[PDB]
Ligand binder design. Sequence first.
Ligand SMILES: [C]C1=C(O[C][C][C]C([O])=O)[C]=[C]C(C2345B678B9%10%11B6%12%13B96%14B%109%15B%1172B932B437B%126(B%13835)C%14%1527C2=[C][C]=C(C([O])(C(F)(F)F)C(F)(F)F)[C]=[C]2)=[C]1
Lengths: 238, 10
Amino acid sequence: KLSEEQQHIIAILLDAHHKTYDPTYADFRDFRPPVRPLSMLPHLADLVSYSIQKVIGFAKMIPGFRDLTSDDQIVLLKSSAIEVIMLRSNQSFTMDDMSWDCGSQDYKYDVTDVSKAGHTLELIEPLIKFQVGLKKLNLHEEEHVLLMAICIVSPDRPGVQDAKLVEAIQDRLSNTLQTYIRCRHPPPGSHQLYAKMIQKLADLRSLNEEHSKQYRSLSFQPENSMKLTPLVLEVFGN
Amino acid sequence: NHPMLMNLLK
Ligand SMILES: [C]C1=C(O[C][C][C]C([O])=O)[C]=[C]C(C2345B678B9%10%11B6%12%13B96%14B%109%15B%1172B932B437B%126(B%13835)C%14%1527C2=[C][C]=C(C([O])(C(F)(F)F)C(F)(F)F)[C]=[C]2)=[C]1
């Protein structure tokens, strides 16, 4: 039985996502232009920096997130940012040509664009496999926003101080998701869906680790760091 | 330390 509180949580997270995800991609006009030599790094750095801002806006609305300390909020957002950005991007991902389609040919990104921002197949191949496996789950929007929120509020992130409180907040979201699947996701799509969604969170930890490796090699070169944004430098490191 | 993160969180 989906309790009234659990329905409330889902409503909050759906609204938070709708307030922090613009499916018209209007703000892409503001980014440095894509050029198709790490020719896509300025554009995709701007895209990521933009997405970081939106992920923070979503995080602030997760029930219980505001009850954490400032330090724990920062630690969770720093460690989860690239994972939530990858999850968030799955909305625009299409399996029809394995690309992130953001409304325009100019704003349609394939594996070549990603390598033109400085990343390598060590990241890109598992990243495509993730996007495909996530897309095949055909998540309800309710489950998509719950998974983003569970990803953010993870008690085993490095540098978490109040792990017991983070865990208490995550457990409320996890039980909401488990009960939503049981009561609202019909079979056969519901089959071991919770375990499959948690497996995706495990995949994101591995993607996070490889992204940070490649980011460090990328940003170690000052010529590359010059093309990043100040927010990206603060979040992913200097 | 994290002034832009902290400002976007307020
Ligand atoms: C959320 C979102 C999105 O969403 C819909 C449209 C936006 C919206 O409306 O939200 C669409 C597309 C992306 C993606 B997909 B995956 B591919 B890879 B990850 B995800 B972002 B960017 B490329 B595209 C990617 C990326 C680029 C740059 C780096 C860097 O490592 C660097 F630039 F290469 F250095 C960085 F430093 F991190 F930027 C890391 C990751 C993210």
